[PDB]
Amino acid sequence: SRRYDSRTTIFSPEGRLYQVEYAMEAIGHAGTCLGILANDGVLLAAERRNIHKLLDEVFFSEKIYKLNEDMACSVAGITSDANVLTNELRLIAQRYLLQYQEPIPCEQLVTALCDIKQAYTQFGGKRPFGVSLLYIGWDKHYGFQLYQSDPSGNYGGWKATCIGNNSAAAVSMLKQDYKEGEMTLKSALALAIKVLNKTMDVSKLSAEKVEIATLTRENGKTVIRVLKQKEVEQLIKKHEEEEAKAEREK
Amino acid sequence: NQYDNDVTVWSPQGRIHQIEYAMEAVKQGSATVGLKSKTHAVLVALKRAQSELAAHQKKILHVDNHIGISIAGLTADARLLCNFMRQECLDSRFVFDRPLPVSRLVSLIGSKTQIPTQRYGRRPYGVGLLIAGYDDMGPHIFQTCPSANYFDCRAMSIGARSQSARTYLERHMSEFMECNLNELVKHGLRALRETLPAEQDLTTKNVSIGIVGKDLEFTIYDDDDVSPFLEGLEERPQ
Amino acid sequence: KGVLMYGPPGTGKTLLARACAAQTKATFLKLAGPQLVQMFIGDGAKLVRDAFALAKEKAPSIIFIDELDAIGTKRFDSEKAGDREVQRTMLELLNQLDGFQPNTQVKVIAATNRVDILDPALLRSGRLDRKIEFPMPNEEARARIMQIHSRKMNVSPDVNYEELARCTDDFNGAQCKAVCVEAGMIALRRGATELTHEDYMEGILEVQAKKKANLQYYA
Amino acid sequence: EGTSADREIQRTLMELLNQMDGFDTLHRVKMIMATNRPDTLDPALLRPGRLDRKIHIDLPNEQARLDILKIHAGPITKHGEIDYEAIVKLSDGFNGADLRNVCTEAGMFAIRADHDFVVQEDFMKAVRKVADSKKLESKLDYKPV
Amino acid sequence: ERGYSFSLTTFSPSGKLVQIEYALAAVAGGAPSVGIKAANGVVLATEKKQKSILYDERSVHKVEPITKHIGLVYSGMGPDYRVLVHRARKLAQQYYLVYQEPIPTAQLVQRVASVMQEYTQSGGVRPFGVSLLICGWNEGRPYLFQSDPSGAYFAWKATAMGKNYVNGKTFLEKRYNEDLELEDAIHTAILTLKESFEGQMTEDNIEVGICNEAGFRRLTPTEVKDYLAAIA
Amino acid sequence: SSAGFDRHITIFSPEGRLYQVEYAFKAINQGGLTSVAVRGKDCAVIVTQKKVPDKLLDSSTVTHLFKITENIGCVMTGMTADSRSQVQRARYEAANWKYKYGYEIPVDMLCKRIADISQVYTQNAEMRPLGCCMILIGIDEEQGPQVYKCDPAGYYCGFKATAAGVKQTESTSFLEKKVKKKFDWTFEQTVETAITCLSTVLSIDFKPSEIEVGVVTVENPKFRILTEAEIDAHLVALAE
Amino acid sequence: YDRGVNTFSPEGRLFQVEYAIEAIKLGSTAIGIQTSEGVCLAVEKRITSPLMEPSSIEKIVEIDAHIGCAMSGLIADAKTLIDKARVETQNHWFTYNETMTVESVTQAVSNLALQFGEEDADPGAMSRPFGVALLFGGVDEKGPQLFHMDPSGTFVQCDARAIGSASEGAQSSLQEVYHKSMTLKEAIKSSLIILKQVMEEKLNATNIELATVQPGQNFHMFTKEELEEVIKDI
Amino acid sequence: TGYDLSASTFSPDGRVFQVEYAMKAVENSSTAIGIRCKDGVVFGVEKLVLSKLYEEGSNKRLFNVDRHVGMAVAGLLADARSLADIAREEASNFRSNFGYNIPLKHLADRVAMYVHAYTLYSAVRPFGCSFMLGSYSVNDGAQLYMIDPSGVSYGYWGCAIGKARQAAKTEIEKLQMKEMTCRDIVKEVAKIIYIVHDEVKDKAFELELSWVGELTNGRHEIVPKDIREEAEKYAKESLK
Amino acid sequence: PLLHPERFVNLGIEPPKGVLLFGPPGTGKTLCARAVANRTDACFIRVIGSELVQKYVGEGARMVRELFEMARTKKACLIFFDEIDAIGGARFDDGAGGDNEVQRTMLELINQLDGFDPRGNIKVLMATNRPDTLDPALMRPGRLDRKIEFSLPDLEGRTHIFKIHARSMSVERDIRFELLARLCPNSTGAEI
């Protein structure tokens, strides 16, 4: 019995533990997602992968999931574990609401899920979860918020982040061009369009190959909208014409 | 040799090796002898100490007023088995209100020690119990082993360098059938002195004695009252 | 037609071959398997048939093949690379025995210590006909072995061989020999004139060669 | 990637495979071949046109074991009644080459004890003296493909 | 007794799960199958072949009804199919007990996929070796779905699985559209199954299932023979 | 073709196969015996051979036929102990079905339950998948005779003529050649064909003391074993 | 290349226990002496940096009013054994209403040393045996008693013991300076002389600690006030 | 290699290797024979004396299972005693549940199933004892069964286990045991054990004989001392 | 025995021939062999195991044959075999024949030491690193009479090695090596 074991919990002579490292190498491929916020409303942009000619296009959502009245999250990596994790945190939020009769703050929910995710890396002898995902939300404590998770277990707040295969270039371009406390929910969309244009190899940015979700605040609604395909095309062509004009200036 | 790391693996010759290694382990302890007459059972043990400033290790244990044991091996498992024996004998005394016959007790020990030699990741017990008792049929001497295989014998000796004692006991077997305790103990001591080098023999600090009889409770003698028994022995011939 | 003898190493096989060669009158050829492996293709089979052809001429000759497991290894199928030259000399050996024309005049003996290796077509009843097997000596034989090899040494009359044989079980023949030379030298260190019982008792612990640890805390 | 000194054989094989069914045709020449295990023969040599018929020669049915026992037992100066059917019933999966050995062992058992004739008990000892020695021979049967 | 309690599926140095890939390779060697939907219902076609005339072709079935309006076909290993069928039946039963309504197709697909995924992370087990096609008709719009040993799932208009699935998908690319009827769908399904079929196609080597807003059922051999005739 | 522990336990090899199960199929052949089953117009016959190599052994307790139920019969091949255990499980399952549902169990449900039980062994990596086969015969209302077969991999099916054992291939070939003629089947014809199949596959011309025959028919659905005398009667009637 | 936690050696040895036995040669040395006047215990500290607080680390800790213990080897896992001894003595006092003997405590704590296991048990202790060596001193009804325990679970009564890295040299020197008619003062002086002789760093009043127990008073631990008096007259 | 370490791995040719190793462990036991008469059975065991220290009657290898059932074992003593205990408990359980003495055809089957349960999983090892069960009843005659460690049990007219099993059965078959009453069988059993195990192999040994049948009114017990004395006195005449 | 071959003959004892030296690395086997080679007066033929691997089939056996022939040419002298564990472990052939020719070389080496008039007046001496892989037929006495084992120095060995290795340097007059010995429990001479 000890001959067939794989020992998926022990350390290594060099200090690190291999399984979480291999999972992070696995999350490298398979998708591209990013999130940005600077004022009322926060936006998530995702790169659709299944773009074959024969898809029925149901469920009104591809990679964006709703977790509460004011919580949404994307995901990258193996999709089945994504289904598991989303279902797992949904009832966490609901049981908090049942006990306290108050919407759950984002930070506590993220910490709870991260604790569950880390439990598998210390004891049990099971394969870890190969999924990393973002969180966007709003609450009365700190307004609007964005956070990022990790198969290792840790997390952290952010202002603009990317997770997909070309995350390095996206992060460099983001830190090169951003302003603190001025970007309204009109310039952030253009910034995301330009970043996606740079990262993906396919030019002309076919509107069916991207997905955009935005969160905005109302008197008592906190409406989440998934803007349709009838509004992406003019945004893209506006980006194209302004880029052509700027290049022609030089 | 991959046929050496578990008690579940069978060798191509049909010999499990962990049991053989436990039988090897039991030979590292000090020697001990046991024998029986018509109406008594006597066992003798030779002690050992590490440094001259340490007390000698105790080898004879008291199980019950009509049952005594002598150990050889490692002490922890010996204590565990001795505790189990105490418990079983007391339970029998409580329920049926009668002493437990030696044979049934030995059978219980045999059935208990056999269990670990079949599961996964379990080791046998390393002990060399010699059991001396008195019952309705008279005296009784028994010997066990780590392989859960008990033997019924009328004279035995085990431990390190036990072969010479066995030779002496075998060639003087008949004389045990008539003599009383006074020279029976002398015969046991003569047998035990055979398994030592030619420098030191018996000084009252390395020898213990245990007697059970028809009308005598299980009694232990050590280091002070052994002198009456130790005197009267001729010097070792050269 | 012929005899094989097999069993664990250190039992008296090659000793029997030497004895038989010492008693008989016939021509005796002595050979060992690995000696037939040769570099140039076809050079080994020539040696095989030339040895049988020599023995045929010396009318009553007998032939002894030691270390047979160096040739008889089981054939196999392979598609990249494999071994074939030795297989091809074996297929000549398997044909000087039995084969297309019977030879009835030469006696074949062969010896090995492992049999699970050998090719079944070699073990066939027509070629190797009696398959003798050699067991490890039981208690009474060890006394006799020790009592033979100490025939020429000066030893005192107080030795009890049926004690020594009794505390040395799971030895084979070679070790029961070696006890006697160890017990000689142990006595020689102290300048003593003849061997005594304790010198044998120490020789036992020499030949056991068990690793050391104190284990004094036992008992 | 076999070694050199192991492509020469593969030229000799090309000569053989070309002499039969080459560019020029045989007449009135016939070829017979025997092998112990035809797993390993080159697929070009087993082609219909070079080796046309394949004849399986197999371990005997009990009727054949009786036939072979009656062949090899005859010349012995046997004595009293003999019941070959018991022998045929015990010997199972024997080669033809083992029944000859049974007949030799039977006489070997009677050279001891100074007899000059054989009786059925000797056959019944020898059958088992042989039958248990087959345990250390591998049991595989190989077949061309 | 007890099990092992350690995962047999682990991550490779290149960030890939090997066992899932091997299970997919085993799936790729199964019997071919095709599935189509066109504006009125769904058609599932699969090919069956007994080794000799001794086998009874009417004793076992490939297409199996979970409930009155859900159908399911498979490609891959044989024995593993029945376990999944039985589990799906149970799940539909608990759903109907709780809600007093027939289960929607999407919920059943999600639950079955969850089971199949959970079966690749627990200890001392190996993943299933089949790929499933599920069809249904609820609230007018027909639905078609495909599962995966890894647990993922997709929604399709037309799908081919099994041997030579790439050729089937390319063939469906140049033929299928969004406006046909069940009869023409049957015709094109048989036509595309004829690409890798045997020499002669008989009315018993093929199993066909149809779902419309009247319910799931399995075509009897008579009308299968009728459809095979007057075509090809 | 192999990488890791795929040769020692039941996990997929790189090509998509697993060997710990297809080793059991060749473990079946260790017994060296063959059994045949034939289905007729209104009856079903099971025939097998038996070998008693020694006189000391009691020949009355070497049967491979077993009475699973008063209406359902079976025959086994392969390792003996595993076959006995499967017989025990089948008996218990049939009795439980009768207790629970209040009417007799169909043969196909029984075969399916047995196969589902056997499929677990090739799913977990701590058990060994029981190298023994299974053939059942029975009578069902509105269906007539039924003959089903089950294997260690969990694959059950329903046949018209079956053979299990060493000589499976050529016996199936002979049965196919006979059945392609499409002639009428009665009791005597079915028994004669079943016996002659084994007789010509093995080429023995045996005696009425070396085979066993079981039969079921729609006149007394009780499973019954033919006595040696009537077996000899069929044997002599076969030889004109 | 992997073997189970319980596995016997070709020569009669256990593998884990032998390793634990040889793993106590990395700890500090400690000396215990028994005399009819009382029991003396002494040990070093091995301070590493000037920023140590020498009062934080301690080796001698009292089990009860009349039983003291000195530990050597690893220190992380001796706390469980110490706590077990405390609780067991209190339970015996609660049930029988008396003070239990030293030997009883030793044999009650030694039963737990060899219960490590990997199969057919609750978590317990997964594998490692304990890796500490303990010296027990006390004064019971038959006078002053000293006992020494061993990671294999073997306890025996001694008259003068030294355990740790410098065990064999200290024992060899100790064999020739002992008799059965000592007083407490000369015992303390001899222990101090030995520790000064073997210790690496220079000896002072903060590098060591000492305890004595007598039939009259209870377990008493010396302080940095009377410790330099016995040093200055060395 | 490595296919022969667990009890859950089929070798490439399709057979289990640990059970074969248990067999080879059995073949070094001493010897034990048992033959049935017109109205009972007789067991016989030759027991070797290792050294003079041991007492007569030590470690009996002829066990008494139930009030009318007897057992004779060969192999490793510890496993044999465990099997005897489990069979004894099972028989008592049966008597308590139903209400009469258990027949052999059921007790032997249950013990065989329990033994076979230890050859599938990798967490336990196969047993190493081969044993014989014997009994006599007024309504069923004499019964003899033999069970091996692989989990197989057959019925016999006479059987032998140990080293020289085949040599013993050679002279077993010469007897016409089908006729005589087992009062004169004791002499021939003694004769047949004194004609094996040459004195070169070992110096001394002793004979253990059991008895059950209608002669004892159903009880099973050791033979009287005088009868065994006469039996061995007769058997010594083989020196001619 | 070579220096004084008169005590043994008078006493009738035939001395052992072979010897083996085994232990963990960096312990003193090769250095002890060098000391022996320096002291002696007969031959001293040194052989490294890895030299017996050859490109063609049937080569290593030849070199073994000529080695023992040249050895027999002299009157009496010694062979040294270093790193045996590279020349033969055990016979295990399975599947495709692998590690097979080296086994033939090992068999020839075994044959040359025993059977049909052994080498006579030739004494061998082999030393190895991991002796758990050696073949059982080779370790039989009559070829490897002695089995000297080299273990890690206990305490006196460490002080003695320190004294030997530091007696030729300029050092302070009052350093104590016993403490240094106590500070390194399990270590070899190389680390000292």
Ligand SMILES: Nc1ncnc2c1ncn2[C@@H]1O[C@H](COP(=O)(O)OP(=O)(O)OP(=O)(O)O)[C@@H](O)[C@H]1O
């Ligand atoms: N007992 C010793 N006395 C003196 N020097 C020693 C001793 N043991 C080891 N050394 C020194 O340590 C080194 C040991 O190397 P050596 O060649 O003797 O090792 P080896 O046993 O051949 O090792 P390996 O098998 O790893 O090659 C040398 O530098 C030697 O001087």
Ligand SMILES: [Mg+2]
């Ligand atoms: Mg030889």
Ligand SMILES: [Mg+2]
């Ligand atoms: Mg070196």
